[PDB]
Structures are given as C-alpha cells and as structure tokens.
Amino acid sequence: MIVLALDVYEGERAIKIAKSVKDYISMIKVNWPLILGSGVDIIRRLKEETGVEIIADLKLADIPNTNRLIARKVFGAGADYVIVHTFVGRDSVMAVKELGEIIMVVEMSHPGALEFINPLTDRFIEVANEIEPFGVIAPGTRPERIGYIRDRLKEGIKILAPGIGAQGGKAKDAVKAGADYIIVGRAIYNAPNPREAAKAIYDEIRGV
Amino acid sequence: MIVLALDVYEGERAIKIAKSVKDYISMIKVNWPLILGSGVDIIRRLKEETGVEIIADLKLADIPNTNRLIARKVFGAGADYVIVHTFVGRDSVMAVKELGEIIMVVEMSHPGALEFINPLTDRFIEVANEIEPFGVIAPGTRPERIGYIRDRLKEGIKILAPGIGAQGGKAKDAVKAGADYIIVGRAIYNAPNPREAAKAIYDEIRGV
Numbered sequence: 105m106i107v108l109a110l111d112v113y114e115g116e117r118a119i120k121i122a123k124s125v126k127d128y129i130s131m132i133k134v135n136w137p138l139i140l141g142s143g144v145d146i147i148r149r150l151k152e153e154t155g156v157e158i159i160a161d162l163k164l165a166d167i168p169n170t171n172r173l174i175a176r177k178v179f180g181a182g183a184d185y186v187i188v189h190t191f192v193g194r195d196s197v198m199a200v201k202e203l204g205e206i207i208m209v210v211e212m213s214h215p216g217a218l219e220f221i222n223p224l225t226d227r228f229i230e231v232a233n234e235i236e237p238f239g240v241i242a243p244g245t246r247p248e249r250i251g252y253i254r255d256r257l258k259e260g261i262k263i264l265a266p267g268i269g270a271q272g273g274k275a276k277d278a279v280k281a282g283a284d285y286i287i288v289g290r291a292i293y294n295a296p297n298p299r300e301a302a303k304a305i306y307d308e309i310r311g312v
Numbered sequence: 313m314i315v316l317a318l319d320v321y322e323g324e325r326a327i328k329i330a331k332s333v334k335d336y337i338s339m340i341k342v343n344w345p346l347i348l349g350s351g352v353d354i355i356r357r358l359k360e361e362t363g364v365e366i367i368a369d370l371k372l373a374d375i376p377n378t379n380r381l382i383a384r385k386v387f388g389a390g391a392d393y394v395i396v397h398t399f400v401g402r403d404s405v406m407a408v409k410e411l412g413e414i415i416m417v418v419e420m421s422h423p424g425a426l427e428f429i430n431p432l433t434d435r436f437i438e439v440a441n442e443i444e445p446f447g448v449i450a451p452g453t454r455p456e457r458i459g460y461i462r463d464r465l466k467e468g469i470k471i472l473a474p475g476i477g478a479q480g481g482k483a484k485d486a487v488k489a490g491a492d493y494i495i496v497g498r499a500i501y502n503a504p505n506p507r508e509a510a511k512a513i514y515d516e517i518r519g520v
C-alpha cells in the first residue's frame with residue numbers, strides 16, 4: 105500500500121501527477137509548503153480529483169487548544185489523517201485524535217534526530233501503544249529500524265515508512281520489514297512516467 | 313514591550329483589532345489557524361496595516377529541508393521571526409535561522425509539557441546558548457521560571473513571555489523577572505475595548 109508524497113509545490117502540476125497515479129496509491133500525503141502555496145483548499149481538491157485518502161503531514165507540536173484548532177480546520181478541509189509529534193505530550197496528541205485519525209512521530213531520520221528524538225523512540229513507542237493511533241512513522245532507509253519498531257509496536261497500529269531507497273527491491277524489503285505503507289515522493293513525481301513508476305513500485309510490492 | 317497574540321482566525325477581524333491597538337504594541341504574533349483561515353499573505357497585510365513586526369508562531373519541528381521550505385515561504389510572506397522547536401535538533405533549527413530571525417521553544421506550559429519537553433529545558437537552554445537565536449519563550453504564568461531561564465540564558469538572547477491575563481499571569485511580574493517582551497492575547501483582543509486594554513498593560517509595564 106503506497107503513499108504518494110506530493111512534494112510538488114506548484115499548483116495544478118501537483119494535482120495532475122496525483123490524479124494519474126490514483127490507481128496505484130492508497131493515500132496522498134501533503135505538507136505545510138503545499139498548503140501554504142496553494143491554500144488549505146488544495147486538500148478538498150486533491151481529493152475530489154483522485155478519490156484517494158489524504159494524510160496532512162503537519163507534525164503538530166503545539167498546545168492542545170491550538171493543535172485542536174489546526175486539526176479541525178485541516179480535517180474539516182478533507183484530510184483523513186494528521187501526523188502529530190509525540191514529544192509535546194499526550195494531551196496535545198489526544199486533542200487531535202478526538203477530531204480524526206492520527207499518525208504519531210516516534211523516530212526521525214535527519215542528523216538532528218539523534219539529539220533528542222531518537223534517544224526517546226522506545227518511550228514514544230510506548231506512548232503510541234497506549235494511545236493506539238492509526239499508525240506511526242518509521243524511517244525506512246534502514247529496514248532494521250522498521251523491524252525494531254514493529255517488534256515493539258502493538259499489532260493493529262500501522263507503520264508508514266518514508267525514505268525508501270531507489271534501488272529495485274527496497275520497497276519490497278521495507279514492507280517485509282514491517283511497513284504497512286511506504287511513503288514515496290521523488291522516485292514517482294519526478295520520474296519520466298509517474299503512473300509507470302507508481303505501477304512498478306506497486307508491482308514490486310506484491311511480489312510480481 | 314507588548315506582543316499581541318492575534319488569535320482571531322477571521323483575517324479581516326484580526327486586521328481590524330490589530331489596527332486599533334497598533335500604537336501600544338511592539339509586535340504581532342500569528343499562528344497556523346489564522347494563516348490557514350486567511351492565507352499566509354495575511355502576514356503582509358497585518359504588517360502594512362499596523363507597521364509592527366510579525367512573529368509567525370509555527371513551532372516548526374520537521375527535518376532541515378522541510379523546515380527551510382516552510383521558513384522560506386513564511387519569511388518571504390513578510391514574517392520577521394519564526395518560532396521553532398529545539399527538540400528536533402540543531403540542524404533543523406539552523407535551517408530556519410539561516411533564512412531569518414528565530415525564537416526557540418525551550419519550555420512549555422500545558423500539562424503535556426511535563427512528559428518530555430520540560431525535563432529537557434536545561435539542555436534546550438544550552439542549545440539556545442550556542443545557537444544564539446533572537447529569543448526564547450518563557451512562561452509568564454510562573455515568573456519564577458522567567459528568572460530561572462534568564463539566569464542560564466546567554467546575555468543578548470531576549471525572553472518573550474505569554475501567559476499574561478487570561479492564563480493568570482501579570483505583566484508587571486513577568487517584566488520584573490526578566491521578560492523583554494510580554495505576549496498577550498485574550499486580555500487585549502477579547503477586551504470590550506482592545507485599545508484601552510492594550511494601553512493599560514502598556515501603562516502597567518511602564519510603571520516598572
């Protein structure tokens with residue numbers, strides 16, 4: 105099950121790519137840049153033009169009432185899931201979950217992640233286990249980490265993995281490692297033929 | 313020096329209120345809900361209509377590249393400062409700092425803050441000491457914490473403190489404890505007469 109990271113911040117060209125690959129993806133993930141550049145409306149619309157669920161990658165990390173306000177507006181705009189940080193606390197996570205499905209951040213892949221976030225991943229996983237969000241993000245650059253998290257995460261809580269390598273077999277390996285969804289951006293929206301690249305990743309995943 | 317927390321999500325109503333108190337405030341702080349409701353261009357309009365600097369309280373907490381994309385757009389839209397989290401690491405903070413002035417989060421006041429953020433406040437302050445942002449936010453609801461932070465914060469980094477009025481904090485207390493700026497929302501924008509409310513706090517802060 106593929107998640108398209110529509111990180112093509114230019115208007116209509118972003119929507120064109122998403123509608124044409126709708127057959128091979130399960131969700132569409134949008135971030136703050138797209139939202140800022142096109143307005144929160146690009147959400148309602150990415151929807152009624154692809155028919156695919158949408159994940160608003162916002163990494164909410166504010167106080168409860170502000171997280172709530174943002175969620176209400178984003179869910180209200182059509183988002184199906186909102187990604188939220190675990191670091192700011194449970195009340196802030198629950199404020200969003202109360203209005204819609206959430207995906208919690210328990211680990212990150214940039215150099216800075218090793219400073220405070222990653223040392224707390226085991227603890228964040230346990231928070232995730234108690235809250236039972238729809239899922240958690242797990243950088244899949246290294247399958248070992250997806251399995252690490254999968255071993256500690258409650259069954260029923262999905263794992264979505266970004267940073268999937270471009271080599272043939274990587275997407276399949278991330279799923280085998282425990283990822284329920286692989287989040288792919290570049291390798292798809294910047295490929296000569298998007299639908300084709302989407303189909304390739306899709307076919308790879310189901311082993312044939 | 314007052315920072316108006318303009319938590320009025322109807323763009324025109326926000327401008328109307330901001331304009332009526334513009335001569336008693338130093339800056340205007342806006343968060344995601346207002347940006348989502350009126351579009352990020354509301355920052356430009358608020359600046360033109362009031363003549364005061366704008367702080368975008370986004371609490372950025374993404375990877376360096378994404379934090380930079382967001383900051384580029386927001387500083388580009390006219391923001392003078394962007395509030396960023398320290399927990400995501402130095403690289404993510406610097407990604408924003410390289411594009412404009414920043415204010416770092418080293419401690420929060422909601423209950424969830426006790427779980428992971430506050431236990432790390434001393435370490436966050438040392439990270440802020442190294443990076444040297446324009447300022448850090450300090451809890452105005454507990455003047456004892458403003459002084460605690462001030463003592464450990466490198467000289468030159470400013471302290472801005474919310475929590476005055478509605479949350480029970482006093483402007484006079486916060487300034488006495490070391491706050492350079494007092495962040496106030498409801499006590500001014502929900503006052504029967506905002507300009508009068510803004511003047512009063514202005515007077516309170518001036519009387520020492």
Ligand SMILES: O=c1[nH]c(=O)c2[nH+]cn([C@@H]3O[C@H](COP(=O)(O)O)[C@@H](O)[C@H]3O)c2[nH]1
Pocket residue numbers: 109111133212213214241243266267268287288289290291375378
């Ligand atoms: O939660 C996350 N932590 C990370 O460290 C990270 N690095 C990349 N990404 C996101 O992965 C998606 C696909 O990235 P690529 O363009 O390299 O395929 C895109 O949405 C990228 O933004 C991350 N998401």
Ligand SMILES: O=c1[nH]c(=O)c2[nH+]cn([C@@H]3O[C@H](COP(=O)(O)O)[C@@H](O)[C@H]3O)c2[nH]1
Pocket residue numbers: 167317319369420421422474475476477478479495496497498499
């Ligand atoms: O820790 C907190 N607990 C709260 O209940 C709370 N309410 C508001 N805020 C933050 O303070 C800014 C201005 O708030 P006021 O309208 O209460 O003056 C607001 O814009 C927020 O940034 C809060 N922070």
